[PDB]
């Protein structure tokens, strides 16, 4: 893996359009991005997928899975934070 | 949150 931190811009896709690549593996708590010439890969897991909303970077996804070869033409799959933020807010409140 | 002190350059 690289010594220094890498970044890459990439587009979000709709789950419907993403199912064209992954079929039924695409669940509701998942969000796809990429298939744009770049790709997350092994070692990137757990990392952020951030989008700028109203001037601040917000966590939209968490690097989850994708192409076993990190194909830059296949979209990467990230945990959809919007579907899990209620669990986060609940866990932080109780601990 | 979300606004770095060192602005990312893309």
């Amino acid at each position: 893996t690289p010594d220094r931190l890498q970044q890459a811009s990439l587009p979000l896709l709709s789950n419907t359009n993403c199912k064209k690549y992954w079929g039924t593996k695409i669940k509701d708590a998942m969000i796809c991005a990429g298939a744009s010439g770049v790709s997350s890969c092994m070692g990137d897991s757990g990392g952020p997928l951030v989008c700028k909303k109203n001037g601040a970077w917000t966590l939209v996804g968490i690097v989850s899975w994708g192409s076993s070869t990190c194909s830059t033409s296949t979209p990467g799959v990230y945990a959809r934070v919007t579907a899990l933020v209620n669990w986060v807010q609940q866990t932080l409140a109780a601990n | 949150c979300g606004v770095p002190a060192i602005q990312p350059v893309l």
Binding site: D3, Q6, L59 | -
Partner: protein
């Protein structure tokens, strides 16, 4: 990240590195405040692993990084490892992060936030650049 580019050091202050006791980087994560890190459930983090904050170049000896111990690993009970669905794990730091210019929090969305198809976002990490 395959086809990415080197980031401006310290410009993604919420990015942390999960390294085992060996010093091996195995996953990334994001600080959501000084005591909590969000990462993926598939990373299989244990309390023997370390959260490294403020790092840019994992091969430098001169960066003032923060190596933070993990007190508890909260794997979303909804996580399905067969389908890799609800892939999120919260890590409660036993030792809180000290926020600075290079260490700070990322915002979390409201469960009602809309992020449209076609929107250009950014992803960061120390994953493989070539597979």
């Amino acid at each position: 990240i395959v086809n990415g580019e080197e980031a401006v050091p310290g410009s993604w202050p919420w990015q942390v590195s999960l390294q085992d006791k060996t010093g091996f980087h195995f996953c990334g994560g994001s600080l959501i405040n000084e005591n909590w890190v969000v990462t993926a459930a598939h990373c299989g983090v244990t309390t023997s692993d370390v959260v490294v904050a403020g790092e840019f170049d994992q091969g430098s000896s001169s960066e003032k990084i923060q190596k933070l111990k993990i007190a508890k690993v909260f794997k979303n009970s909804k996580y399905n490892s067969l389908t890799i669905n609800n892939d999120i794990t919260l890590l409660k730091l036993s030792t809180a992060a000290s926020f600075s210019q290079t260490v700070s929090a990322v915002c979390l969305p409201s469960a009602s936030d809309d992020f449209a198809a076609g929107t250009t976002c950014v992803t960061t990490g120390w994953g493989l650049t070539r597979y």
